[PDB]
Design a protein around this ligand. Structure first.
Ligand SMILES: [Cl-]
Ligand code: NA
Length: 129
């Protein structure tokens, strides 16, 4: 599913990401924008042979099992395929775990490069929340 900006913001708010670990909602919507373009089915292969999955491009090196990343850990304990669902629950719960591991949203390279220290409120501008 390809979310609209406001639809996704609303789904993320309901799932408890608004201010999760100090990160306002615009941040989460901004990251998803540049990570996957709002597409739950987005996948990308990294050079180490690990793959990124879903709306928040969660990495199989650490976070999920996709059965083809030798030596990786499964820190969210889900198949990576569960991150591609049109229901963002699994992606949102795994995100919460990533953002708490000490590095905050700097885990998401597109956030750090494209969202950090920008006007992120602009990504929830005008949505009925
Ligand atoms: Cl932080
Ligand atoms: Na893994």
């Amino acid at each position: 599913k390809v979310f609209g900006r406001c639809e996704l913001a609303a789904a993320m708010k309901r799932h408890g990401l608004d201010n999760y670990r100090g990160y306002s909602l615009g941040n989460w919507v901004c990251a998803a924008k540049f990570e996957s373009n709002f597409n739950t089915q987005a996948t990308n292969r990294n050079t180490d042979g690990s793959t990124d999955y879903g709306i928040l491009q969660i990495n199989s090196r650490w976070w999920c099992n996709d059965g083809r990343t030798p030596g990786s850990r499964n820190l969210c304990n889900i198949p990576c395929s569960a991150l591609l669902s049109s229901d963002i629950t699994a992606s949102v719960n795994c995100a919460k775990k990533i953002v708490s591991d000490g590095n905050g949203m700097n885990a998401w390279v597109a956030w750090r490069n494209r969202c950090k220290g920008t006007d992120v409120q602009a990504w929830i501008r005008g949505c009925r929340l």
